[PDB]
């Protein structure tokens, strides 16, 4: 059930350690937590490679849409990694595609998408993506 | 998406740490409201198979569009309806509104597949459950 | 265990589906989230313009909790609050959580805020309007 | 005074998440207790053989506390130190401290108590041997 993206389809990977409370009452990682992984993977990259300044930066990215399909369960305390790529890169917006893998492993357990719009921090009006971010996002394309 | 498109409403209060570093409810928390809105209904209305745990719903897909920000301590209202109702699965449509207001701040959906506890093998939706879901179409 | 009449301020707080952990009861970290929500709601409604506009903020420097009886989604909780010690820059809150129809708290704890200038995190005298709000919660 | 690395027996890195940071821009005080929960249960499952899915005996938290000395923020790297202070018939007191990568003095330090109970009834039980051994391995006379 449902075509499962492979590792080679993603341009950048990031390990994320699972926490006790990632598990829900059914004993696996709750479906809401995947979106926390998405947020974490994307912004870590933006901080590290795009020079995103989340404390005092004048430009920030806001999530305007997200989705996720869940293929196979994961559980604390398993080790997981996020694969990340950029699909469409617009003037002020960017579309990420993500997948979660059980480490060293081939087929994604879950895969989804989300969109940042870049905005003036202190107004929240859409801005053209600053170059240093633009180049970090492009590095993740195709 | 407007208030009158949804059939069932649940108020939810925000918590302090709902806000993220940019000062609004983090996008991830909206999914928690989605779940809390649905599972509150299922728990209060969904039958003994739901209530006792022999039959459980697992989320297999979800999504969300964000139109306008909310922030702790704002009180929110979740609107809910059921779109498709299959043999063992259901697709929910939700929208978050601020009190008094017609236009949604945020709107999405998700699917439960219903399954036996032990096996996670898909099961036909129990009748009391089915009734409760059909009531939201 | 603590009783309702030992506190000065009460607020309901509803649970969420994923408050529950793997063992089926509200996870023990969520109780601190309640403490913070209860105190910060009070501060926002009563705390003063220096709180309300954000030049002065409270930071948590210690906290603790005793857990007596479990809580589970979708149970609704009554938070009792009082202020124990009120210093120059800092305040100790005492909280207890109650379920409808148990006399005794299911859980109780405490935490300390230090008030600080937000842009620098340096401790400040508690602003008057805030201090007044806090004093009103001293037994 | 802040606790030091050398005072702890067992260490566990935890990756910070986007939403760990609160509106003041650092890791919220509440999240520290998720680190406590995470560090302790990882150890019980990996070294103690705790079975969180179908085990008959589980640990429940009966008290916990924390002191916070210096802030940390996502996306910093953090490590939990762990030792066992008191070890009783059915209960155990853990001492934990959070350290930034390659820093000797704790950012925060606290404790929590597990009582071990039969899962179905929550009645306290003698700690199972295999778990007791794992806990005793974290006690030092140093």
Coordinates of C-alpha atoms in Angstrom, one line a residue:
Chain A
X1 CA 0.0 0.0 0.0
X2 CA 1.2 3.3 -1.6
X3 CA 4.4 3.8 -3.6
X4 CA 7.1 4.3 -1.1
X5 CA 9.8 6.8 -1.9
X6 CA 13.3 5.6 -1.9
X7 CA 16.4 7.2 -0.3
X8 CA 18.0 8.1 -3.6
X9 CA 15.1 10.5 -4.4
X10 CA 16.2 12.9 -1.6
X11 CA 19.1 15.3 -1.7
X12 CA 19.8 15.9 2.0
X13 CA 19.4 13.8 5.1
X14 CA 19.1 14.6 8.8
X15 CA 18.9 12.1 11.8
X16 CA 16.3 13.0 14.4
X17 CA 16.2 11.1 17.8
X18 CA 12.8 9.9 18.9
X19 CA 11.4 10.9 22.3
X20 CA 9.5 8.9 24.9
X21 CA 6.3 10.8 24.2
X22 CA 6.5 10.5 20.4
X23 CA 4.6 7.3 20.9
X24 CA 0.8 7.4 21.2
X25 CA -1.5 4.9 23.0
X26 CA -1.2 2.5 20.1
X27 CA 2.5 2.2 20.7
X28 CA 3.9 4.0 17.6
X29 CA 5.0 7.5 16.6
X30 CA 1.8 9.6 16.6
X31 CA 0.9 11.0 13.2
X32 CA 1.1 14.7 14.3
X33 CA 4.8 14.2 15.3
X34 CA 5.8 13.7 11.7
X35 CA 5.1 17.3 11.0
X36 CA 7.4 18.2 13.9
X37 CA 10.1 16.2 12.1
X38 CA 9.3 18.1 8.9
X39 CA 9.6 21.5 10.6
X40 CA 12.8 20.3 12.3
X41 CA 14.5 19.0 9.2
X42 CA 13.7 22.0 7.1
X43 CA 14.6 24.8 9.5
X44 CA 17.8 23.0 10.6
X45 CA 18.9 23.1 7.0
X46 CA 17.8 26.7 6.5
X47 CA 19.8 27.7 9.6
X48 CA 22.9 25.8 8.7
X49 CA 23.0 26.2 4.9
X50 CA 20.8 29.2 4.2
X51 CA 21.9 31.4 7.1
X52 CA 18.3 31.7 8.4
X53 CA 18.4 33.7 11.6
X54 CA 15.4 32.6 13.7
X55 CA 16.3 34.7 16.7
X56 CA 16.7 38.1 15.0
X57 CA 16.4 37.6 11.2
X58 CA 14.2 40.0 9.4
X59 CA 13.0 37.4 7.0
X60 CA 11.3 34.1 8.1
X61 CA 9.4 31.3 6.5
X62 CA 5.8 30.5 7.4
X63 CA 4.1 27.2 6.7
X64 CA 1.0 27.8 4.4
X65 CA 0.3 24.1 3.7
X66 CA 1.5 20.7 4.5
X67 CA 0.5 17.1 3.9
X68 CA 1.8 13.6 4.8
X69 CA 1.0 10.0 3.9
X70 CA 1.9 7.3 6.4
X71 CA 3.1 3.9 5.0
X72 CA 4.6 1.9 7.9
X73 CA 4.8 2.7 11.6
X74 CA 7.9 3.9 13.6
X75 CA 8.3 3.9 17.4
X76 CA 10.4 5.5 20.0
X77 CA 13.2 4.6 20.6
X78 CA 14.0 3.7 16.9
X79 CA 16.4 5.9 15.1
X80 CA 15.0 7.9 12.1
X81 CA 16.3 10.0 9.3
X82 CA 14.6 12.7 7.2
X83 CA 15.3 13.0 3.5
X84 CA 14.7 16.4 2.1
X85 CA 14.4 17.9 -1.4
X86 CA 13.0 21.1 -2.9
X87 CA 10.3 20.7 -5.6
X88 CA 9.1 24.1 -6.8
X89 CA 11.0 27.2 -5.9
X90 CA 9.0 30.4 -6.5
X91 CA 9.7 34.2 -6.0
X92 CA 8.6 34.2 -2.3
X93 CA 7.6 30.5 -1.8
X94 CA 9.2 27.1 -1.7
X95 CA 7.8 23.6 -1.9
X96 CA 9.6 20.9 0.1
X97 CA 9.3 17.2 -0.2
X98 CA 10.2 15.0 2.8
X99 CA 10.3 11.3 3.7
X100 CA 11.1 9.5 6.9
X101 CA 13.4 6.4 6.8
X102 CA 14.3 3.8 9.5
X103 CA 18.0 4.3 9.4
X104 CA 20.3 2.7 6.8
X105 CA 16.9 1.6 5.2
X106 CA 15.5 1.8 1.7
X107 CA 11.7 2.6 1.5
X108 CA 10.1 5.5 3.3
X109 CA 7.8 4.9 6.3
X110 CA 6.1 8.2 5.5
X111 CA 6.4 10.9 3.0
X112 CA 5.0 14.4 2.6
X113 CA 5.3 18.0 1.5
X114 CA 5.0 21.5 2.8
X115 CA 5.3 25.1 1.6
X116 CA 7.1 28.0 3.2
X117 CA 6.2 31.5 2.3
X118 CA 9.0 34.0 3.1
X119 CA 7.8 37.1 4.9
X120 CA 9.1 40.2 6.6
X121 CA 9.3 39.1 10.2
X122 CA 7.7 42.2 11.7
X123 CA 4.8 42.6 9.3
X124 CA 4.4 39.2 7.7
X125 CA 4.2 40.5 4.2
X126 CA 5.7 38.2 1.5
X127 CA 9.2 39.1 0.5
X128 CA 11.4 37.9 -2.4
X129 CA 13.6 35.1 -1.1
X130 CA 16.9 36.5 0.0
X131 CA 19.8 35.2 -2.2
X132 CA 21.7 33.2 0.4
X133 CA 18.5 31.3 1.2
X134 CA 17.7 31.0 -2.6
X135 CA 21.0 29.4 -3.2
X136 CA 20.6 26.9 -0.3
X137 CA 17.1 26.0 -1.5
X138 CA 18.2 25.5 -5.1
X139 CA 21.0 23.3 -3.9
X140 CA 18.2 20.9 -3.0
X141 CA 16.5 20.8 -6.3
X142 CA 16.2 17.8 -8.7
Chain B
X1 CA -14.1 27.5 3.8
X2 CA -17.0 28.9 6.0
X3 CA -18.6 27.8 9.3
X4 CA -21.8 26.6 7.7
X5 CA -20.0 24.0 5.7
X6 CA -19.4 21.9 8.8
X7 CA -21.8 19.9 10.9
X8 CA -20.2 19.5 14.3
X9 CA -18.2 22.0 16.5
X10 CA -15.7 21.6 19.4
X11 CA -14.1 24.5 21.2
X12 CA -10.4 24.0 22.1
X13 CA -8.4 26.3 24.3
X14 CA -4.8 27.1 23.5
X15 CA -1.8 26.3 25.8
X16 CA 1.1 28.6 26.5
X17 CA 3.6 26.5 24.6
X18 CA 1.3 26.2 21.6
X19 CA 3.1 29.4 20.4
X20 CA 6.3 29.0 18.6
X21 CA 9.3 31.3 18.4
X22 CA 7.5 33.5 15.8
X23 CA 4.7 33.9 18.4
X24 CA 1.8 32.1 16.8
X25 CA 0.3 28.6 17.2
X26 CA 2.9 26.3 15.6
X27 CA 1.6 24.6 12.4
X28 CA 2.0 21.2 13.9
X29 CA -0.4 21.9 16.7
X30 CA -3.3 22.2 14.3
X31 CA -3.1 18.5 13.6
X32 CA -3.4 17.9 17.4
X33 CA -6.7 19.9 17.2
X34 CA -7.8 17.8 14.2
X35 CA -7.2 14.7 16.3
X36 CA -8.7 16.0 19.5
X37 CA -11.8 17.2 17.6
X38 CA -12.4 13.9 15.9
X39 CA -11.5 11.6 18.8
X40 CA -13.6 13.6 21.3
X41 CA -16.6 13.0 19.0
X42 CA -15.7 9.3 18.5
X43 CA -15.2 8.8 22.3
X44 CA -18.5 10.6 23.2
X45 CA -20.6 9.2 20.4
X46 CA -18.7 6.4 18.6
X47 CA -20.0 3.3 20.5
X48 CA -18.6 0.6 22.8
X49 CA -16.2 -0.9 20.2
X50 CA -14.6 2.5 20.0
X51 CA -14.9 3.3 23.7
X52 CA -13.5 0.0 25.0
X53 CA -10.7 -0.2 22.5
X54 CA -11.3 -3.5 20.4
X55 CA -11.6 -1.3 17.3
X56 CA -9.3 1.6 16.7
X57 CA -8.8 4.3 14.0
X58 CA -5.3 4.8 12.6
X59 CA -4.4 8.0 10.6
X60 CA -3.1 7.1 7.2
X61 CA -3.1 10.6 5.5
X62 CA -3.6 14.1 6.6
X63 CA -3.2 17.7 5.3
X64 CA -3.6 21.3 6.2
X65 CA -3.8 24.7 4.5
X66 CA -3.1 27.7 6.8
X67 CA -4.8 31.0 6.0
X68 CA -4.5 33.2 9.0
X69 CA -2.5 32.9 12.2
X70 CA -3.9 32.1 15.7
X71 CA -2.0 32.7 19.0
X72 CA -2.3 31.6 22.7
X73 CA -4.5 32.6 24.5
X74 CA -7.1 32.7 21.7
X75 CA -9.9 30.3 22.0
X76 CA -10.6 28.3 18.9
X77 CA -13.5 26.4 17.4
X78 CA -13.1 23.3 15.3
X79 CA -15.7 22.5 12.6
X80 CA -16.0 18.9 11.5
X81 CA -17.7 17.0 8.7
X82 CA -17.3 13.6 7.1
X83 CA -16.6 13.6 3.4
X84 CA -16.2 10.0 2.2
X85 CA -17.3 7.0 4.3
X86 CA -16.0 3.7 3.1
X87 CA -16.2 0.1 4.4
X88 CA -13.4 0.4 6.9
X89 CA -12.1 4.0 6.4
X90 CA -13.5 7.5 6.7
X91 CA -12.2 10.9 5.4
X92 CA -12.8 13.9 7.8
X93 CA -12.8 17.5 6.8
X94 CA -11.9 20.1 9.4
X95 CA -11.6 23.8 9.8
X96 CA -10.4 26.1 12.6
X97 CA -12.4 29.2 13.3
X98 CA -11.9 32.1 15.8
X99 CA -15.0 32.6 18.0
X100 CA -17.8 34.6 16.3
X101 CA -16.3 34.3 12.9
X102 CA -17.3 32.7 9.6
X103 CA -14.0 32.4 7.6
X104 CA -11.6 29.6 8.6
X105 CA -8.1 30.4 9.8
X106 CA -7.0 27.0 8.7
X107 CA -8.6 23.9 7.1
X108 CA -7.6 20.4 6.4
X109 CA -8.5 16.7 6.4
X110 CA -7.4 13.2 7.3
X111 CA -8.3 9.6 7.0
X112 CA -8.8 7.0 9.7
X113 CA -8.6 3.4 8.8
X114 CA -10.4 1.3 11.4
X115 CA -8.6 -1.8 12.6
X116 CA -8.6 -4.5 15.2
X117 CA -6.3 -3.6 18.2
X118 CA -4.1 -6.7 18.3
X119 CA -3.5 -7.1 14.6
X120 CA -3.9 -3.7 13.0
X121 CA -5.9 -5.6 10.5
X122 CA -8.6 -3.4 8.8
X123 CA -12.2 -4.1 9.9
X124 CA -15.6 -3.1 8.6
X125 CA -16.7 -0.1 10.7
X126 CA -18.9 -1.2 13.6
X127 CA -22.6 0.0 13.2
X128 CA -22.7 2.3 16.2
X129 CA -19.6 3.9 14.8
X130 CA -21.0 4.1 11.2
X131 CA -24.1 5.8 12.5
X132 CA -22.0 8.4 14.3
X133 CA -19.9 9.0 11.2
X134 CA -22.9 9.2 8.8
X135 CA -24.4 11.8 11.1
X136 CA -21.6 14.1 10.1
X137 CA -22.1 13.8 6.3
Chain C
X1 CA -2.8 15.4 49.5
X2 CA -3.7 19.1 48.8
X3 CA -7.3 20.2 48.9
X4 CA -9.1 22.8 46.8
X5 CA -9.6 25.2 49.6
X6 CA -5.9 25.7 50.0
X7 CA -5.6 27.6 46.7
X8 CA -6.8 31.1 45.7
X9 CA -7.4 30.9 41.9
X10 CA -9.0 28.2 39.7
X11 CA -9.2 27.6 36.0
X12 CA -10.4 24.6 34.0
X13 CA -8.0 23.1 31.4
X14 CA -9.2 20.4 29.0
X15 CA -7.0 17.6 27.8
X16 CA -6.0 16.7 24.2
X17 CA -6.0 13.3 22.5
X18 CA -2.2 13.1 22.4
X19 CA -1.8 14.2 26.1
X20 CA -2.0 10.5 26.7
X21 CA 1.2 8.5 26.6
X22 CA 1.8 4.8 25.7
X23 CA 0.5 3.7 29.1
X24 CA -2.9 5.4 28.4
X25 CA -2.7 8.3 30.9
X26 CA -1.8 12.0 30.6
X27 CA 2.0 12.1 30.3
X28 CA 3.9 13.6 33.2
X29 CA 5.4 16.4 31.1
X30 CA 1.9 17.7 30.2
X31 CA 1.3 18.6 33.9
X32 CA 4.0 21.3 33.7
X33 CA 2.3 22.6 30.5
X34 CA -0.8 23.0 32.6
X35 CA 1.1 24.9 35.4
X36 CA 2.5 27.3 32.8
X37 CA -0.8 27.7 31.0
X38 CA -2.6 28.4 34.3
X39 CA -0.1 30.9 35.5
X40 CA 0.4 32.7 32.2
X41 CA -3.3 33.0 31.6
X42 CA -3.6 34.7 35.0
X43 CA -0.6 37.0 34.3
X44 CA -2.2 38.0 30.9
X45 CA -5.6 38.7 32.4
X46 CA -4.3 40.4 35.6
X47 CA -0.6 40.9 35.3
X48 CA -0.2 44.5 34.2
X49 CA 0.8 46.4 31.0
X50 CA 4.5 45.7 31.4
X51 CA 3.6 42.0 31.2
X52 CA 0.9 42.6 28.6
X53 CA 3.1 44.5 26.1
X54 CA 6.2 42.4 26.7
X55 CA 9.0 44.6 28.0
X56 CA 9.0 42.4 31.1
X57 CA 8.7 38.6 30.9
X58 CA 8.9 35.8 33.4
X59 CA 11.4 33.0 33.0
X60 CA 11.1 29.6 34.8
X61 CA 14.1 28.9 36.9
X62 CA 12.8 25.8 38.9
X63 CA 9.8 23.6 39.0
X64 CA 8.6 20.3 40.5
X65 CA 5.6 18.0 40.6
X66 CA 4.2 15.2 42.7
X67 CA 1.8 12.8 40.9
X68 CA -0.8 11.1 43.1
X69 CA -3.6 9.7 40.8
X70 CA -3.7 9.5 37.1
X71 CA -5.6 11.7 34.6
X72 CA -6.6 10.7 31.1
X73 CA -8.0 12.2 27.9
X74 CA -10.7 13.5 27.7
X75 CA -11.0 14.3 31.4
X76 CA -11.3 17.9 32.3
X77 CA -9.1 19.3 35.1
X78 CA -9.5 22.1 37.6
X79 CA -6.1 23.9 38.3
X80 CA -5.8 25.6 41.7
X81 CA -3.1 28.3 42.0
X82 CA -1.6 30.4 44.8
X83 CA 1.5 32.4 45.4
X84 CA 3.8 31.2 48.2
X85 CA 6.8 33.5 48.3
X86 CA 6.9 36.9 46.5
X87 CA 10.4 38.4 46.2
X88 CA 11.9 41.5 44.6
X89 CA 12.3 39.9 41.1
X90 CA 10.9 36.5 41.6
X91 CA 7.8 34.6 42.7
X92 CA 7.0 31.0 43.8
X93 CA 3.7 29.5 42.6
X94 CA 2.0 26.5 44.1
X95 CA -0.4 24.5 42.0
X96 CA -2.7 21.5 42.4
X97 CA -4.8 19.6 39.8
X98 CA -8.2 18.2 40.6
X99 CA -10.7 16.0 39.0
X100 CA -14.5 16.4 39.5
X101 CA -15.5 14.4 42.5
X102 CA -12.1 13.6 44.0
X103 CA -11.6 15.9 47.0
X104 CA -7.8 15.4 46.9
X105 CA -5.5 16.8 44.2
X106 CA -4.4 14.1 41.6
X107 CA -1.1 16.0 41.2
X108 CA 0.5 19.1 42.9
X109 CA 3.7 21.1 42.3
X110 CA 5.3 24.5 42.1
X111 CA 7.6 26.7 40.1
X112 CA 9.5 29.9 40.2
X113 CA 9.4 32.8 37.8
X114 CA 12.2 35.4 37.6
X115 CA 11.0 38.6 35.9
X116 CA 13.5 40.0 33.5
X117 CA 13.8 42.5 30.8
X118 CA 13.0 40.6 27.6
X119 CA 15.6 42.1 25.3
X120 CA 18.5 41.2 27.7
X121 CA 17.2 38.7 30.2
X122 CA 18.4 40.8 33.1
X123 CA 16.2 40.6 36.3
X124 CA 13.9 43.5 37.0
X125 CA 11.9 44.6 40.0
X126 CA 8.4 43.1 39.5
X127 CA 6.3 45.9 38.0
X128 CA 3.6 47.2 40.3
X129 CA 0.5 46.0 38.4
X130 CA 2.0 42.5 38.2
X131 CA 3.1 42.5 41.9
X132 CA -0.4 43.5 42.9
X133 CA -1.8 40.6 40.8
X134 CA 0.5 38.2 42.5
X135 CA -0.1 39.5 46.0
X136 CA -3.8 38.8 45.5
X137 CA -2.9 35.1 45.3
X138 CA -1.1 35.0 48.6
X139 CA -3.1 33.2 51.3
Chain D
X1 CA 26.5 25.6 41.7
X2 CA 26.0 23.7 38.5
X3 CA 26.5 19.9 38.4
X4 CA 29.5 18.7 36.3
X5 CA 29.7 16.0 33.6
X6 CA 32.0 13.8 35.8
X7 CA 29.1 13.4 38.3
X8 CA 27.0 11.4 35.8
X9 CA 27.5 7.8 34.7
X10 CA 25.5 7.5 31.5
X11 CA 25.2 10.0 28.6
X12 CA 22.7 10.3 25.8
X13 CA 22.6 12.9 23.1
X14 CA 19.1 14.2 22.2
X15 CA 18.5 16.3 19.0
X16 CA 16.6 19.5 19.6
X17 CA 13.4 20.2 17.6
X18 CA 12.0 23.3 16.0
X19 CA 9.2 23.6 18.5
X20 CA 11.4 23.1 21.5
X21 CA 11.9 26.9 21.5
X22 CA 9.3 29.0 23.0
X23 CA 8.4 32.6 22.2
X24 CA 11.4 33.8 24.1
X25 CA 13.5 31.8 21.7
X26 CA 14.9 29.1 23.9
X27 CA 14.0 25.6 24.9
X28 CA 10.9 25.8 27.0
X29 CA 11.2 24.6 30.6
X30 CA 8.6 21.9 30.1
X31 CA 10.6 20.2 27.4
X32 CA 13.4 19.4 29.9
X33 CA 11.1 16.8 31.4
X34 CA 10.6 15.1 28.0
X35 CA 14.4 14.9 27.9
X36 CA 14.3 13.2 31.4
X37 CA 11.6 10.8 30.2
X38 CA 13.5 10.1 27.0
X39 CA 16.9 9.6 28.6
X40 CA 15.6 7.3 31.3
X41 CA 13.3 5.1 29.2
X42 CA 15.9 4.7 26.5
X43 CA 18.3 3.3 29.0
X44 CA 15.6 1.0 30.6
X45 CA 14.7 -0.4 27.2
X46 CA 18.3 -0.7 25.8
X47 CA 20.1 -1.9 28.9
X48 CA 17.3 -3.1 31.2
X49 CA 15.1 -4.9 28.7
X50 CA 12.0 -2.8 29.5
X51 CA 9.2 -3.9 27.1
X52 CA 7.0 -0.8 26.6
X53 CA 4.7 -2.5 24.0
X54 CA 3.8 -5.7 25.9
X55 CA 5.8 -5.8 29.1
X56 CA 4.1 -6.7 32.3
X57 CA 6.0 -4.3 34.6
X58 CA 6.3 -0.6 33.8
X59 CA 7.8 2.5 35.5
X60 CA 5.4 5.4 36.4
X61 CA 6.7 8.8 37.5
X62 CA 5.6 9.8 41.0
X63 CA 7.6 13.0 41.3
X64 CA 10.1 15.1 39.4
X65 CA 11.9 18.4 39.7
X66 CA 14.3 20.6 37.7
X67 CA 16.6 23.6 38.2
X68 CA 17.5 25.7 35.2
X69 CA 20.8 27.5 35.2
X70 CA 21.5 28.6 31.6
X71 CA 19.3 28.5 28.4
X72 CA 19.7 26.2 25.4
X73 CA 17.9 26.7 22.1
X74 CA 17.1 24.6 19.1
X75 CA 19.2 23.7 17.0
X76 CA 21.9 23.3 19.6
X77 CA 23.2 19.8 20.4
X78 CA 22.5 18.6 23.9
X79 CA 23.4 15.5 26.0
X80 CA 21.7 14.1 29.1
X81 CA 23.7 12.7 31.9
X82 CA 22.1 10.1 34.1
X83 CA 22.8 8.4 37.4
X84 CA 20.7 6.6 40.0
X85 CA 20.7 8.1 43.5
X86 CA 18.4 5.9 45.6
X87 CA 17.3 2.4 44.6
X88 CA 14.5 0.9 46.6
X89 CA 12.3 -2.2 46.7
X90 CA 9.9 -1.0 44.0
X91 CA 11.1 2.5 43.2
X92 CA 14.2 4.4 42.0
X93 CA 15.4 8.0 42.1
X94 CA 17.3 9.2 39.0
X95 CA 19.5 12.3 38.8
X96 CA 19.7 14.0 35.4
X97 CA 21.6 17.0 34.0
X98 CA 21.5 18.6 30.6
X99 CA 24.8 19.6 29.0
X100 CA 25.7 21.5 25.8
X101 CA 28.1 19.6 23.6
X102 CA 31.6 19.8 25.0
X103 CA 30.6 21.9 28.1
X104 CA 31.4 20.7 31.6
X105 CA 28.7 22.5 33.6
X106 CA 25.1 21.6 33.4
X107 CA 22.6 23.9 31.8
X108 CA 19.9 22.4 34.0
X109 CA 19.7 19.6 36.5
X110 CA 16.9 17.6 38.2
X111 CA 15.5 14.3 39.4
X112 CA 12.6 12.0 39.0
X113 CA 11.3 8.9 40.8
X114 CA 9.9 5.8 39.0
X115 CA 7.7 3.4 40.9
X116 CA 7.5 0.0 39.0
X117 CA 4.0 -1.4 38.8
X118 CA 2.1 -4.3 37.2
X119 CA 0.8 -2.7 34.1
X120 CA -2.7 -4.0 34.2
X121 CA -3.4 -2.8 37.8
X122 CA -0.7 -0.2 38.5
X123 CA 0.0 -2.1 41.8
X124 CA 3.6 -1.6 42.8
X125 CA 5.9 -4.5 42.3
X126 CA 9.5 -5.5 43.4
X127 CA 11.8 -4.3 40.6
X128 CA 12.6 -7.2 38.2
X129 CA 16.2 -8.4 38.5
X130 CA 17.2 -7.4 35.0
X131 CA 15.9 -3.9 35.5
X132 CA 17.4 -3.7 39.0
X133 CA 20.8 -4.7 37.6
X134 CA 20.6 -2.0 35.0
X135 CA 19.7 0.6 37.6
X136 CA 22.5 -0.5 40.0
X137 CA 25.0 -0.1 37.2
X138 CA 24.2 3.7 37.4
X139 CA 24.9 4.1 41.1
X140 CA 28.4 5.3 42.1
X141 CA 30.2 5.7 45.5
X142 CA 32.4 8.3 43.8

